[PDB]
Symmetry: C5
Amino acid sequence: KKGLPPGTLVYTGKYREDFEIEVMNYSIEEFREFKTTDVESVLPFRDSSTPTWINITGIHRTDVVQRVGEFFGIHPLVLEDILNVHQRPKVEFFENYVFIVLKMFTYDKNLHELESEQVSLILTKNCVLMFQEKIGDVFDPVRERIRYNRGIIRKKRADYLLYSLIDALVDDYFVLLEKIDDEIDVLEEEVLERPEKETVQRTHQLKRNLVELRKTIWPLREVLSSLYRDVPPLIEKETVPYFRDVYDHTIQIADTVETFRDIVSGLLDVYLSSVSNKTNEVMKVLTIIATIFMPLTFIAGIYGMNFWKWGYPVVLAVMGVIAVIMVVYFKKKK
Amino acid sequence: KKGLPPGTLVYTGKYREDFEIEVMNYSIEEFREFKTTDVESVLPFRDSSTPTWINITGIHRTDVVQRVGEFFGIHPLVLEDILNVHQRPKVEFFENYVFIVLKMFTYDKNLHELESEQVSLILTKNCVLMFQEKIGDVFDPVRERIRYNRGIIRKKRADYLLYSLIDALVDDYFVLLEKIDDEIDVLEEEVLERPEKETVQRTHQLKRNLVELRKTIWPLREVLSSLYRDVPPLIEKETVPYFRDVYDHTIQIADTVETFRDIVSGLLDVYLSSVSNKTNEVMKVLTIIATIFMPLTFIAGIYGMNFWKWGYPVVLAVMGVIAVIMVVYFKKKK
Amino acid sequence: KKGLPPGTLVYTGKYREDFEIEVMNYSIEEFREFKTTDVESVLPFRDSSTPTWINITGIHRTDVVQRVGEFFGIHPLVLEDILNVHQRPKVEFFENYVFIVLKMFTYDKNLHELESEQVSLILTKNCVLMFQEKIGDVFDPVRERIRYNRGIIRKKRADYLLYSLIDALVDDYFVLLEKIDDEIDVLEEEVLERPEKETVQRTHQLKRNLVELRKTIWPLREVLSSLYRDVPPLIEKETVPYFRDVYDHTIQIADTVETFRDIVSGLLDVYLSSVSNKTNEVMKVLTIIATIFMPLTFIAGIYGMNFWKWGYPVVLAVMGVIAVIMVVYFKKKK
Amino acid sequence: KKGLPPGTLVYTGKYREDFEIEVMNYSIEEFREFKTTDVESVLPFRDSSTPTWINITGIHRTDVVQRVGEFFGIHPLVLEDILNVHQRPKVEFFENYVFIVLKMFTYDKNLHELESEQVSLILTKNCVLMFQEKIGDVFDPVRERIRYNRGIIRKKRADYLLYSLIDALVDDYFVLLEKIDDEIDVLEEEVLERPEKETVQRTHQLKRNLVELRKTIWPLREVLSSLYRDVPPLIEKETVPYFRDVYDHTIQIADTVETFRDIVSGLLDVYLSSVSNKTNEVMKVLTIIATIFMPLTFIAGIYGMNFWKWGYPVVLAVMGVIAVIMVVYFKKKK
Amino acid sequence: KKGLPPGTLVYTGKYREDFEIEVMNYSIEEFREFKTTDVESVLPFRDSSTPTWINITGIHRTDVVQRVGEFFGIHPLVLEDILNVHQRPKVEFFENYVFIVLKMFTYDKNLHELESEQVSLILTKNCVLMFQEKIGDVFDPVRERIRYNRGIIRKKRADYLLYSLIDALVDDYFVLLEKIDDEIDVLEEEVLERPEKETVQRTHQLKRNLVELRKTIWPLREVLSSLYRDVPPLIEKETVPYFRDVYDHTIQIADTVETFRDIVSGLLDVYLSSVSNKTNEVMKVLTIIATIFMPLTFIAGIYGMNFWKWGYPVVLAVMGVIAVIMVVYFKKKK
């Protein structure tokens, strides 16, 4: 089911398994990280001048979110939507904090199905609050840039770090689609030249799969559309243009998914075609052999009477000619 | 049946049974409630210092609705659109009172097709006038929060009471959709593997019911559209943020309804794919036992002539060989 | 067959039968009504202080229309579109008069097909000029309101009179949809279960009707759209609220029509399903009796050899075994 | 081919046979017309204060168009867009003249498909420069209005001359669609009751043609859209109101085209229905004579044994009873 | 493999074969060109007072591109999307340099499916920086115009040279469409009257290839829509109108691809009719020879009784009578 209260902290998902707090504070020269299971050890990062990313992996522990929320000054309505996993990826704007909800898919090969967790992000002063349902993600390459000063992540502010985690999750969508395209191509070829039972079963799954994505990606476009024109954390022409490379990344997917659904729309029709092509050929064999073997067992049936003479190389000779008379007629359709 | 007069008080619904006036007045410290059949006793509540929730259930009583409209100061054209329950969910903005028309869906499981009542809301000064068609609703959580002081409902003003009732009403659609989801997931799956008579029947009703739903949800989103950028009795940064967690809740439902229709649209094309191959499976059996058994019923037919000697293990030997030649020939289509 | 002149007065319609000029002049207290064929007797009303409604039934009298225009002050371009019955319902806001083109459908039960007369309206100073193609209209209740002092038609000015008629015309469309709904709600039931010759025909005609209805209601809503954010003669806070109830009524219709088209769209798809299964109903009986009786007409055909002895109950015993072997095999499809 | 040059005068049309220049100059009481092959005899009509309609029929003569453009001061890009006939119907607003591209369709009756020529219209000081590819245009009624001095064509200025032609060009489309309506009204009838081989050959040509028009009419509507809210040469109190009845006329066309395409849309699906029902009619016949005459040819097959005696009217009595038993079973599907 | 780094420089295509730098510098009377394998030699062109076209064919050399970037002050984020060939055709606007990404199509005739290379363009001061993947392009007519001094390419500025290359590209899409046109116009025919196995194969591929085009031309028009109401380097009344004939052309393309997509849309609905019809032709032959011959193989079967006397011409007379009855009965279906 769903929820019924007015605005309380309740988890909706199904990852009541893991709990970690992977914080990675870093400036221009120094960086420190630690993976703890205590909130009192990570809260003081609030008024820290050094850019800090606070990852909480295991949002089943409600009280922890409430503890982090009441301290940072997050309004009740927002903290709820962090735990409510069936929410529409959105962008909420307030006076002192920016709130963003995102999704992260993980697809299984061969067996068709995809399940996702809700990655919640919040930007305040110099902090990036991250929220996951389960352990393990696709933020590993972002961690790598922090750990060994790769690129320019160390040089930049906190909102860049946000935009670094966003671009990396959008990068995962690329890989996701890149994994889907290879899964369509050959399996879509086996629709025309290998049509049977589960061939349709696997198709309806893809439509559902594609709808699943487009309904999650469609608002992702407007997510970045509202963040391009207003810019509350400003620092304009360094973060904003970097954001276009992420917007070009999101608009890319938008039309890329419409490409798959557009093809799979007319893909189910192709099935009936290659099946109807074999409907007629099974109708052909059945008709020819009834067209010629039916009159000949009929002329043998009346000959099978037993209550004029002549015929063995007389009737069975015209029986051989009439058999050829019907074969020639059967090449005005082949 | 439809209307004809210029704009009088006529009830078009078919619930002329129940009638009970329920009023719930509360402040930050006190709480009072009662259930009566007299309208004169609920009138002085118009100019109350403390927020008041006036629930008038069973509006088939024409003059009773009129009595409230005359006292509170509600324009006659609106009082018509309350008794007329076939209206499109809309939001009217007046200088004094706020008017909202909403729907409440009661869905019957297994046996398909749905019926709905019209919940009309009016917000003036510090009162919320609620108009229902029949006894029994989904606003019990609101009642439960007033009665035992749960959440923050007591602390806030009169407009929050409106938004509290709206949150409970919108949360019903979640369950409504969640019930339709479980009435498709296990029924759509059985469309391909178990296709029969009532399989096409209940398929078309879903198509009807989804359209019935989307044409009521589509304006229901727009009900909140004007209820965002205008907001006359504002109290801004208290109701507006709470509103957004209902606007993102109404969009979620709206787009989830689109997820439903899109799958059901091309669902009937899948049905023909489940038949096409099961038409050809009946074709393969009908052609084989006519292409192997027609030439052998013909050879026995010509051997039935009774007007060369030799064969019993000579002719049946070749009739068996020719029968095997057809087995090899029927393995270029499997 | 259409028009080619620069812009004069040619009646393109098909009702070249009747001609009557009905006039209803009323105030807050007095009321008069008279019917005449003399055009000279109905023109003095142009400068009348009291509101008046002039019905010009049967516009096939080209010269009569020319007389009214040159007197009331009607630009020839506007006069032309009135006799041009193949017009897109529109609203012209000329500096001194309001011009509105409309449509009125009368439906035939059982035997489908629809036809319309173009009801044109003009508001200037204190008079409403009405135009019809034939005798008979849906404006009977309006007359009943003026004659018997019903509602608030006597008390108001001349623009309300215009909106009274428009309210009546829209209310006609409400019954039309219900009549069409009742010609689908019960006819749809026999589309799936009684599949015959004309069953396909009516689907096409309803699709034709709904399009011939769509492209008349789609602009009809936009007629009021421009008539919403403008109104030159105005009296806003006394007309705008009234008019709105009609704009909510037309937007109800606009959606209602799209509701029908949406159902009837994939209604023909259902028809092939009501055939594919019914083809396989017959495919069963045809295959059964040739799969069990074809080897048995073959084993008895080879026993038709006359040129082993043994059995009457020796072969008929295996004939009963081989027959049952095909009865067991035919329960992997049922 | 299309082209490789930057912006030169190249003719990609295929009507290199005719060459005539027709000029009509008038004021209000006088008018002159002459057909000449010289361009130096028509150039001095640029500085003519009285309205001049210069028509250049057969633009294949490259340099002939250039001489007009060089003298009247036409910019290179437009000059090419006169000879390049594939151009998308557009309207160009420049500093000293108004340019308009319009298509004229010639429809072939019975035998389908249609070809087209490009008409170019340039409006300068007091001239309307017309361009054509072949002798044959729907501008005759305009000529006849000038010749016998009909309507009000004389009284007005130059831009009215441009609008007159356009109004007479739009009227051709009313007839053009009228010729398509009938090509559907009569042929679409015999689609459901005359299923041949080349029936689909013509149906597909409507799906080619209805696209051919809507790609030309779509810009046409918008060609007037911009010609509504702009109008540089002004005299709007007689030109703009006249324009409106050409704009509604161009909307009437656009709306009717998409009325046709929607009926033709689900038309082909109707064809499969009339085939699937007639597949059942043949399925009904093919089963009976194999459901009754397959077991009866079998009982005579077991009586084909010749290696009990009893009856002739005893066996044929049970052969006749079993046969009528199957006649009763065949009344559970009809 | 897709991208994972932050915003560095990596080639993503497949053509890591060639490397050529081609520079064309000119003015009113002068012209220069050369092919160098050294990058340092094409650097001082940035500050040339004369317009220059710098082509860097073979971008895979990351260092070469990086060298040009840091020299021209091109921001890394833009430089990425140059080597990142898997992008959306977009237009960027900076104060000093203008950037444009445009796809270029190469099509193989008869044997379907196509391949593309990304052409990057950077305009700054008086230079146009082109970025091809492989040797061979569509910029030949331009090179012809620069050397021989054809047209007005010499007389205009640097931005015109960018526009001269753009029109040369938009023109190639006309050639691409023309090929695909005849790859459909004649191939569409031979699907109805020539139905085969691989015929459905290429039908689906052109469904995809239309998406590949339209989902690349759709934003290729937006490239010019943004490049219309902007004009940073301007040169106004010279380039502004020139652009429009490149905009009108790219509109034509968009209106041409949608045309195919609308015809090829329901092209497979025709194919099921090509089956459905010839299914029933085969159904007619299968029924007749079982409707005339089956009741006569039954009479001859019961006449094959061996356990009345009379006729050879008494039975074969009624055999002929019944055979005729079935012939007359088959004239209610032809």
